[PDB]
Every structure is written in C-alpha cells, then in structure tokens.
C-alpha cells in the first residue's frame, strides 16, 4: 500500500456527526471529535501496516496484516473485531461488534486520501491532504 | 405578548441537529429541517395567541390560550400535549408525549427573538430578527 504511506492532515469533513450518532457515540465525545483536526500517519514494515491517528485529545494506533482479523479498541472505546483488505487499490476496513458492523474505506483520489465511513445507510466523507 | 407580535426570519442556529437527534427525529427530516430557513409569525386575537412557522417544506400553526393544555402535532409528526405560559416576559412551552418532555422558550433579547430548545441536557439556540 505504497500510495498510502505518509503523514496526512484533515482538510474537510461531511456528515461525520451523523455517522457518529448512528454508531452510538455520546454527545460529549461527538463534540470533542468535531473539534479535532487529526493527522493520519500510515507506514508499512514487512507485512504489517500501521495506521496512527493523532490529535490533542486522543491518539489511536492499529497495526495489522491485510486479511487477518484483529482486536481494535476504537477512539470512542468500542472493542471491535476488525479486518482490512486491499481491494481495487483501496484499504477496506470492516469493524464488527454486538451484532453490528460499519465499513471504513480509505482510498486515493487525485493527490488526496479520502476516508468514507458507512453505518446503516448514513455515509460520511473526510478528505485528507499530505502534511 | 405584544413584544412578540410580528413576522420574524431565522438568522442563526446552534446545536439544532443535536436537539432533533435527542428528540428522536429521523435522518431525512433532520436534513430537511437543517435546510429550512423558516419565518415565524406571531399574532394575538382576544386571548388566543397564534404561532405559525412557514417554510417551503412544511408550515405549522398552533393557536392557544396561555395556561390551557392543548393537543399539538409537531413538524416531525409527534402528537404531543402542550402548555405555554408567560413567565418573566418569555413564552415558556412544555411538550409532553410517551413519558418524555422538552421545553421551548421564546424570549426577546435586544431587537431579536431567541428560541431556546432543551431536551435532556442538550440545548439548541435559534435567533430570529424582524422580517
Ligand atoms: C476524548 C475522545 C477524543 C477523540 C474522539 C474521537 C471519536 C471518534 C468517533 C468514532 C470513531 C469512528 C472511527 C474512525 C473513523 C475514521 C475517522 C478518520 O480517520 O478521519
Ligand atoms: C418534511 C418536514 C419538513 C420540516 C421539518 C421540521 C422538523 C423540526 C423538528 C422538530 C420540531 C422541534 C420543535 C420546533 C422547535 C422550534 C424551531 C423554531 O421555531 O425555530
């Protein structure tokens, strides 16, 4: 996933509070999240890919092998099972917990990285540019 | 309530989508409501006060006597019991339905009319100026 490696900074967000509401994130955490302008750092070492998100409030980091299910504790503190595959040049992540699931797709668009988050028909789009 | 009579147009809104989420309004109706810039028309005839809200999408109208509980069907189609009193120069409305309640306060602030909506600790503020 060489096209993804680097440090990226958030440029725009669309419908992310609606997505967080659908996931069940509480009011105060949604308000902190809408104030954060995270940096995303992606790196690869052998067959482990790492995605780190850094903000004043909370940093998250996951390291995984593409295709192997793993445990992840999300920024809003859900304990989920995640699997990320490389499909059509995009990193496609599915998180499952309590009989629910959500899909987070990270893809390149021009010189940007676009994150699309989908939960039961609500879709949010976040655009990042290279820092 | 002479200080309220007139036609008013929305100038700003703060946290109204969060208030609607707390009330239980669905995604599409919340999206229509956030696109509307309603006009509010208040008039008095004898002891009946009328508050009408007009938008491209939906008009609502309630007529009431201050202090007498009445039936109201809200813009998002809840059937509620409402009572509005005049307290401290503000119109204070309480709506009750299914064991829940929310308070909508309409007050003058300078040359503006301010609507404050409260549902379980989430507060939204909408400011109107004379049309
Ligand atoms: C005090 C907590 C501060 C941080 C709160 C962040 C809350 C985020 C909420 C839900 C996580 C959803 C999963 C991440 C989606 C991708 C976001 C992105 O990379 O832009
Ligand atoms: C197709 C429907 C179009 C209109 C949708 C409007 C939805 C409003 C949602 C909930 C009603 C809450 C009660 C009104 C609060 C006061 C609003 C105001 O006067 O500014």
Swiss-Prot record, chains A, B:
Tree of life domain: Eukaryota
Outcome of swapping residue 57 to A: Abolishes ligand-induced translocation to the nucleus
Record's keyword annotation contains Oxidoreductase: no
Protein residues bound to a fatty acid: 126-128
Record's keyword terms, sorted: Acetylation, Cytoplasm, Lipid-binding, Nucleus, Phosphoprotein, Transport
UniProt short sequence motif Nuclear localization signal, positions renumbered to this chain: 21-31
GO CC terms: cytoplasm; nucleoplasm; nucleus
SUPFAM superfamilies hit by this protein: Lipocalins
Entry-linked Pfam families: Lipocalin
Record note on what altering residue 66 to A does: Abolishes export from nucleus
Single annotated GO MF: long-chain fatty acid binding
Cellular compartments annotated: Cytoplasm; Nucleus
UniProt effect for mutating residue 31 to A: Abolishes ligand-induced translocation to the nucleus
Swiss-Prot/TrEMBL GO biological process terms: brown fat cell differentiation; cellular response to lithium ion; cellular response to tumor necrosis factor; cholesterol homeostasis; long-chain fatty acid transport; negative regulation of DNA-templated transcription; positive regulation of cold-induced thermogenesis; positive regulation of inflammatory response
Modification Phosphotyrosine, positions: 19
Residues modified to N-acetylcysteine: 1
Keyword ATP-binding: no
Recorded domain comment: Forms a beta-barrel structure that accommodates the hydrophobic ligand in its interior.
Family: Belongs to the calycin superfamily. Fatty-acid binding protein (FABP) family.
Role description: Lipid transport protein in adipocytes. Binds both long chain fatty acids and retinoic acid. Delivers long-chain fatty acids and retinoic acid to their cognate receptors in the nucleus.
Subunit structure: Monomer. Homodimer. Interacts with PPARG.
Record-given protein name: Fatty acid-binding protein, adipocyte
Native organism: Mus musculus
Gene: Fabp4
């Amino acid at each position: 996933c060489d096209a993804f490696v680097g440090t990226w900074k958030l440029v725009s967000s669309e419908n992310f509070d609606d997505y967080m509401k659908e996931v069940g994130v509480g009011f105060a955490t949604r308000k902190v999240a809408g104030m954060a302008k995270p940096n995303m750092i992606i790196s690869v070492n052998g067959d482990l890919v790492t995605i780190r998100s850094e903000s004043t409030f909370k940093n998250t980091e996951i390291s995984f092998k593409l295709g192997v299910e793993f445990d992840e504790i999300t920024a809003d503190d859900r304990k989920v099972k995640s699997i990320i595959t490389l499909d059509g040049g995009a990193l496609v992540q599915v998180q499952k917990w309590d009989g629910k699931s959500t899909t987070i797709k990270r893809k390149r668009d021009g010189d940007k990285l676009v994150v699309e988050c989908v939960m039961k028909g609500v879709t949010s789009t976040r655009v990042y540019e290279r820092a």
